Amino acid sequence: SELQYLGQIQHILRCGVRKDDRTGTGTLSVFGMQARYSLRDEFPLLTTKRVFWKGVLEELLWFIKGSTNAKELSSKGVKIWDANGSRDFLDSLGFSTREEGDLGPVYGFQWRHFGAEYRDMESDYSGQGVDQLQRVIDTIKTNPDDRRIIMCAWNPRDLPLMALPPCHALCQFYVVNSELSCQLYQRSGDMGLGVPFNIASYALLTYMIAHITGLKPGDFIHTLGDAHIYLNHIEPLKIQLQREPRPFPKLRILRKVEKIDDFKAEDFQIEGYNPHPTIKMEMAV
Amino acid sequence: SELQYLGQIQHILRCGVRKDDRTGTGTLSVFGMQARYSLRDEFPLLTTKRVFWKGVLEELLWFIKGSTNAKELSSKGVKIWDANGSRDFLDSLGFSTREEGDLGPVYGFQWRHFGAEYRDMESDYSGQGVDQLQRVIDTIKTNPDDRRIIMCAWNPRDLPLMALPPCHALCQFYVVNSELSCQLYQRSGDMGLGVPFNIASYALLTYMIAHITGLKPGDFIHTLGDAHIYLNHIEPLKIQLQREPRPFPKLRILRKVEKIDDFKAEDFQIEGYNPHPTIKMEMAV
Ligand SMILES: COc1ccc(CC(=O)O)c(NC(=O)c2ccc(Cc3c[nH]c4nc(N)[nH]c(=O)c34)cc2)c1
Ligand SMILES: COc1ccc(CC(=O)O)c(NC(=O)c2ccc(Cc3c[nH]c4nc(N)[nH]c(=O)c34)cc2)c1
Ligand SMILES: O=c1ccn([C@H]2C[C@H](O)[C@@H](COP(=O)(O)O)O2)c(=O)[nH]1
Ligand SMILES: O=c1ccn([C@H]2C[C@H](O)[C@@H](COP(=O)(O)O)O2)c(=O)[nH]1
């Protein structure tokens, strides 16, 4: 299962093409990839290197609450968005009225209030826009055979107001034999840094929704647009490519939860996570 | 290349699971599939059975014009949408105010006026909403390395107003070595009927955009959500699965076109299309 992520890494280093990008760093890029990770009695948290599990759980709870306040996530110890919410970055993009830590209409806002008019990170939008997350849960409970259980974060209207446009832009759920599956379309994949994080994030979301809807976790299908390896990540990924993968850990939910909003960080427990040492990979800014 | 579509058919018949759907017909379904079709000096128009090429070209020009009037497409000889625009069908879904042939805010409206308020099929929306198709062309000309060249038709706000929600919901373009590639995310794929049509449609759109932007056609990446074979299509697809694929035809554009709106149906010419006989496959309504 983890061999699919490693096979994608090996393919990019061997068959990828050099390609410049929004940053000064270069990449080896491949367009159009797909991998399938089993969620059955296992959780795909990569073992060939340590994955920031605390950031995965806290950011998803941050998404579900509909928050767009990077400082609210930074207070829980996760600073993965602080760079895109810094005063000097909001000023550069012309957001001279947003307080520091206001990312704009991002994942949390699109999942819960699609179409609503965005004010600021402190506003309450309850009852405004389309609650895609709850409608997805409702359609699973009442019509599992529905082929439209889709949550989309790509809003061309709200794109200019975002610090960073969504990378995981669209996801779709699927039910058969009481198994809940999820496919994610990711337009841009940092194979060294973001991709292992995003895999754990959407596998966690499937476990949450399967717990609420009474289903068993099935598969996670990771579909990529621009799958790229930054040049400064080639050697860190060559080290990881020599490590033998270990069995995936397991995820246990500690209490019966009724609504998706009732989940707390203490409700989750990772078991048997024995990863290889952390491999440093700088973030391209 | 055509063996990838046939390999997907073989996999669904062998490994698919029974699954009911919106219609009374059943399906054999598989969640999460991907195929890559080369657009280099060839056009992926299936040869193991005849594909309605006249409908592919006319429907795409109908999409590009932003039209939502099924009667305007039916007048060109293509009646693929008349079922979803019939007076007796609009009334069934409660659309007791639209004149016959008004599909609502569908592909053509979303490509050209995303976010605009939908009135009726006869309105002129020039200058309203987001023109996703033209910005995709602009970004390709000025910044080919951009990882955000996305056209999305999934609008949760406009979903209840559509006769049929988009199946080809999101597509992304990609440029490298002066080759234009396109990946389509299709939430629901009728493997017998729609999928061969959709492949030719988005391969045609890539040829159109590559012609305008001065690039060469690269690859088409077809990504599927619910890839299903209807029960009444199992035996027709077994016949097709025994036919030896023939070389793909070629597509030649007859005149230099400047804008995407200037394309006419007579500007295109299919050469060397020698398909196997048509195989009848009823449409599930
Ligand atoms: C493994 O141990 C740790 C320990 C601590 C941290 C927190 C920290 O990073 O300080 C991390 N971090 C992450 O897990 C991380 C960082 C960035 C994302 C997404 C993301 C935003 N913006 C981007 N820009 C580029 N180029 N690439 C990207 O990937 C992203 C996703 C995950 C890892
Ligand atoms: C000899 O080949 C021919 C000749 C003539 C025709 C025109 C005609 O159909 O009269 C056709 N038709 C199509 O190529 C066709 C029909 C429907 C679509 C999409 C579509 C809408 N709604 C759906 N519902 C279900 N279940 N499945 C689907 O696939 C769709 C895509 C293509 C094929
Ligand atoms: O969840 C995320 C967020 C970001 N990125 C990476 C992909 C790119 O390397 C970079 C975003 O840059 P663009 O594609 O927007 O230019 O961040 C991810 O992989 N996953
Ligand atoms: O461009 C299109 C339009 C429709 N369909 C098929 C897929 C499904 O069989 C049906 C739509 O039904 P829902 O998935 O909305 O239930 O039409 C396609 O394959 N391609």
Strand A168-176 to A150-152 pairing: antiparallel
Question: Rounded CA gap, A187 and A159, in Å?
Answer: 14
The tokens describing B105, both together, are: 């805010």
What are φ and ψ of residue B70, in 5° steps?
-60, -30
CB contact set of B128 (below 8 Å; sequence gap of 6+): B113, B116, B117
Question: Rounded CA gap, A188 and A230, in Å?
Answer: 12
Q: How many CB atoms lie within 10 A of CB B230?
A: 22
What are φ and ψ of residue A209, in 5° steps?
-75, -35
Judged by DSSP in three states, B161 sits in: helix
Element (H, E) at A99: none
Ligand 4 atom index nearest CA of B191:
19
Judged by DSSP in three states, B242 sits in: coil
Helical pair A194-213 and A53-64, crossing angle rounded to 10 deg: 50
CB contact set of A122 (below 8 Å; sequence gap of 6+): A69
**DSSP string for A131-147:** -HHHHHHHHHHH-TT-T
Resolution (A): 2.4
Look at chain A and report how many structural domains it folds into. 1
The tokens describing B138, both together, are: 């602009």
Tell me the helix, strand and coil percentages in chain A, rounded to 5: 35, 25, 45
The tokens describing B123, both together, are: 């309105």
| Ligand 2 center from residue B179 Cα (angstroms) | 31
Q: Is A147 annotated as a binding residue?
A: yes
| Ligand 4 center from residue A266 Cα (angstroms) | 42
Nearest to B181, CA basis, from B154, B149, B134: B149
Residue A75: which domain range? Answer: 1-285
B148 contacts in chain A (CB < 8 Å) = 165, 187-188
How far is C-alpha B60 from the chain's CA centre?
8
Which residue's CA is the nearest one to ligand 3's atom 13? B147
Contact A29, A188 (CB under 8 A): no
Question: Rounded CA gap, A109 and A68, in Å?
Answer: 7
Question: Rounded CA gap, A60 and B213, in Å?
Answer: 40
Please answer yes or no on whether B223 and A157 come within 8 Å at the CB atom. Answer: no
Burial of A201-236, coded b for 16+ CB within 10 Å and e otherwise, reads bbbbbbbbbbbbbebebbbbbbbbbbbbbbeebbeb
Q: How many CB atoms lie within 10 A of CB B120?
A: 12
Q: How many CB atoms lie within 10 A of CB A115?
A: 16
Judged by DSSP in three states, A59 sits in: helix
In the structure, which protein residues have their CB atom closer than 6 angstroms to any atom of ligand 4? A 147-148; B 21-22, 164-165, 167-168, 188-190, 194-195, 198
Q: Is A167 annotated as a binding residue?
A: yes
- Identify the DSSP state of B190: E
**DSSP string for A256-276:** --SSGGG--GGGEEEES--PP
- Identify the DSSP state of A96: T
Question: Rounded CA gap, B263 and B253, in Å?
Answer: 10
Q: Which residues of B are catalytic?
A: 167
B176 contacts in chain A (CB < 8 Å) = 17, 19, 29, 31
Please answer yes or no on whether B185 and A146 come within 8 Å at the CB atom. Answer: no
* Pick from A176, A219, A225: CB nearest B17: A176
Question: Rounded CA gap, A61 and A201, in Å?
Answer: 10
| Ligand 2 center from residue B138 Cα (angstroms) | 32
How far is C-alpha B157 from the chain's CA centre?
22
**DSSP string for B14-82:** HH-EEEE-SSSSEEEEEEEEEEEEE-TTS----SSS---HHHHHHHHHHHHTT--BHHHHHTTT--TTG
Nearest to A268, CA basis, from A220, A221, A205: A205
Residue B66, amino acid: G
CB contact set of A230 (below 8 Å; sequence gap of 6+): A25, A26, A27, A190, A192, A284
Judged by DSSP in three states, B107 sits in: helix
Strand A27-38 to A250-253 pairing: unpaired
Find residue B69's DSSP bridge partners. B102
The tokens describing B274, both together, are: 């020698």
Residue B8, amino acid: Q
Nearest to A103, CA basis, from A132, A74, A146: A74
Q: Is A15 a catalytic residue?
A: no
**DSSP string for A186-252:** EEEEETTTHHHHHHHHHHHHHHHHHHHHT-EEEEEEEEEEEEEEEGGGHHHHHHHTTSPP----EEE
CB contact set of A271 (below 8 Å; sequence gap of 6+): A249, A250, A251, A252
We report the CATH number of the domain holding residue A137 as: 3.30.572.10
Tell me the helix, strand and coil percentages in chain B, rounded to 5: 35, 25, 40
Ramachandran category for residue A282: left, alpha or beta (phi over 0 → left; psi -120 to 50 → alpha): beta
What are φ and ψ of residue B136, in 5° steps?
-60, -40
Contact B134, B151 (CB under 8 A): no
* Pick from B115, B157, B165: CB nearest A130: B157
What are φ and ψ of residue A273, in 5° steps?
-85, 105
Residue B243, amino acid: R
The tokens 């070595």 sit on which residue?
A: B177
Residue A47, amino acid: T
How close A33 gets to chain B, by Cα (Å)?
8
The tokens describing B201, both together, are: 């449609």
Q: Please tell me the number of Cα atoms within 13 Å of A55 on its side-chain side.
A: 16
The tokens 């940092």 sit on which residue?
A: A190
